Design a protein around this ligand. Sequence first.
Ligand code: NA
Length: 91
Amino acid sequence: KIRLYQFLLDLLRSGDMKDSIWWVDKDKGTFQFSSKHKEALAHRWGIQKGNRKKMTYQKMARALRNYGKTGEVKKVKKKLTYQFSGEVLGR
DNA sequence: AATAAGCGGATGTGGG
DNA sequence: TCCCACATCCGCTTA
Ligand code: NA
């Protein structure tokens, strides 16, 4: 199954949910979720994974926090903003 | 208060 | 066995 950081990177490349997520500085890998439309994107993640329960932005962000150590995605000190690692962007 | 984002420990589930 | 890569639950903190 596709990994969460890859799901998000794929969405940013396709632009299929442009109203839910967007690049801030794509060269730096920084991206931001929509305050009002992030739940629709979270729902899509859960359906793609076939999880038992409805996915929520809160649970999706809890999963993102677990990348902080290994570095695939880091939280930026801006609202709803995150940053992919160079390695993630390179692949 | 109402609303929202942030934080993260503890535990449960998948598929190796 | 026991790690992977989250999912889920819960409560606290900050704005
Ligand atoms: Na929020």
